[PDB]
């Protein structure tokens with residue numbers, strides 16, 4: 001599972017053309033109080049919520065990693081370029097997000 | 109704010125026609141590890157995530173309380189009746205949920 005996490009991370013870095021400029025991105029699994037995922041752009045570290053991680057599907061992990069890595073590419077000034085890239089990879093992004101929240105809400 | 113919480117709760121109980129059969133519903137604010145809200149149907153208690161609560165708008169609290177109180181009305185066997193009532197109160201329920209997750213993700 002941890003090997004698949006780093007494999008998706010490595011594939012996502014290549015598809016987003018980020019291998020040029022950084023690629024030294026790490027994934028840290030820790031409990032987060034109010035977020036599913038976060039990223040430290042200075043430490044180049046993606047933090048995934050330990051309490052949510054067991055319940056995530058392959059599509060959801062891929063969506064979450066692409067969303068966080070895109071903060072290394074485009075910021076608030078290029079929000080249109082950010083959403084364009086995110087939508088081209090995941091045009092069903094709203095249904096992914098809706099199904100994730102529903103699943104986490106029902107699952108005990 | 110706590111007075112507005114109990115006032116929305118009281119109004120939601122009346123609009124959902126739940127004042128007949130129970131109405132002795134309580135709201136408890138506690139930190140939750142993987143949920144925004146939860147309900148104990150036996151203890152008639154709605155639990156709202158302490159870490160998320162400061163960031164919720166009036167529409168979001170109203171949506172969350174109606175969603176949890178509707179578990180007292182309709183279960184898995186009447187999922188169509190559950191969604192029908194939820195959609196008639198909040199037909200923009202998907203946009204509410206999408207904007208909430210985005211806001212919590214951006215806010216630090």
Ligand SMILES: [Zn+2]
Pocket residue numbers: 067068071213
């Ligand atoms: Zn993000």
Ligand SMILES: [Zn+2]
Pocket residue numbers: 105175176179
């Ligand atoms: Zn619910």
